[PDB]
Design a protein around this ligand. Structure first.
Ligand code: KAN
Ligand code: 0J9
Ligand code: NA
Length: 254
């Protein structure tokens, strides 16, 4: 029973997280760990279901939350997981601004690990043909947040982002297992160490720049040096600006 797993907890609601799911924090239970409960209704039920199976798969290879219980009915999905203790990379960077180089070094190592998983292990497709079709549909359904674009595209109609993006194509993918939202909010640090990642709903085979682009974008809030250091430590000396720009533009749609 979900009820059995939830008994005796205090409940909070967190406005946070990748999809439009409702996120609950369960805490304050004596002799019991903190948990998270994601609830997806309607279309969002699919997003939560997507995360569940990706968590179930990727846990063999990388440190992620542990699934405690999952339920799917036609219109609803409930995903109960353990909490990874600690703070986000973003939080720790703000708290220890002097540790930026160490934080990025750890992020590169972690990303290198993820990208070293042989793609023959991965039953999920997250390639650009798949994501572009997802983006087209989100745009057409009116779901794109046009207020949240990067500075380069501030005030751009979503249609212009779409058109301009297609001028970069095509390129041959350098396919690896990707996280899909490798941002500073989704990597968790605890006592100095990067100990896990969260929000794995977009995990699948894709170009390595899917992850590199999003993290590089985040680091741009802090330091051009930290952005360059990410590529350097990851093992890339000449960043592919076309692939970088493509993936930044694609993320505008999500
Ligand atoms: N709609 C839901 C999505 O919203 C955010 O994604 C958006 C980014 O945040 C935006 O970028 C802004 O925030 C960055 C730090 O995250 C800054 O570096 C950057 N300069 C900022 O423009 C980017 N333009 C679009 C991207 N879809 C969440 O991260 C993602 O999990 C969630 O699913
Ligand atoms: C459920 C979801 C994917 C959104 N998630 N979220 C976190 C998380 C981590 C660190 C600080 C937070 C602060 C406020 C809300 C959530 C968190 C988190 C976590 N640690 N462990 C597992 N899932 C987490
Ligand atoms: Na809209």
């Amino acid at each position: 029973n979900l009820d059995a797993d939830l008994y005796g907890y205090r409940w909070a609601r967190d406005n946070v997280g990748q999809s439009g799911a409702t996120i609950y924090r369960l805490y304050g239970k004596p002799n019991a760990p903190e948990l998270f409960l994601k609830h997806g209704k309607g279309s969002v039920a699919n997003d939560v279901t997507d995360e569940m199976v990706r968590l179930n798969w990727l846990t063999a290879f990388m440190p992620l939350p542990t699934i405690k219980h999952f339920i799917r009915t036609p219109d609803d999905a409930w995903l109960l997981t353990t909490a990874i203790p600690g703070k986000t990379a973003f939080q720790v960077l703000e708290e220890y601004p002097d540790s930026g180089e160490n934080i990025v070094d750890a992020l590169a190592v972690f990303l290198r690990r993820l990208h070293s998983i042989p793609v023959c292990n991965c039953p999920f497709n997250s390639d650009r043909v798949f994501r572009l079709a997802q983006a087209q549909s989100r745009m057409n359904n009116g779901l794109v947040d046009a207020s949240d674009f990067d500075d380069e595209r501030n005030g751009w109609p979503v249609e212009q982002v779409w058109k301009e993006m297609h001028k970069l194509l095509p390129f041959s993918p350098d396919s690896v297992v990707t996280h899909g939202d490798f941002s500073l909010d989704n990597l968790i640090f605890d006592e100095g160490k990067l100990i896990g990642c969260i929000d794995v709903g977009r995990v699948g085979i894709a170009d390595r720049y899917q992850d590199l682009a999003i993290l590089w974008n985040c680091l741009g809030e802090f330091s051009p040096s930290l952005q360059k250091r990410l590529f350097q430590k990851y093992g890339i000396d000449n960043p592919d600006m076309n692939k970088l720009q493509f993936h930044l533009m694609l993320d505008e749609f999500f």
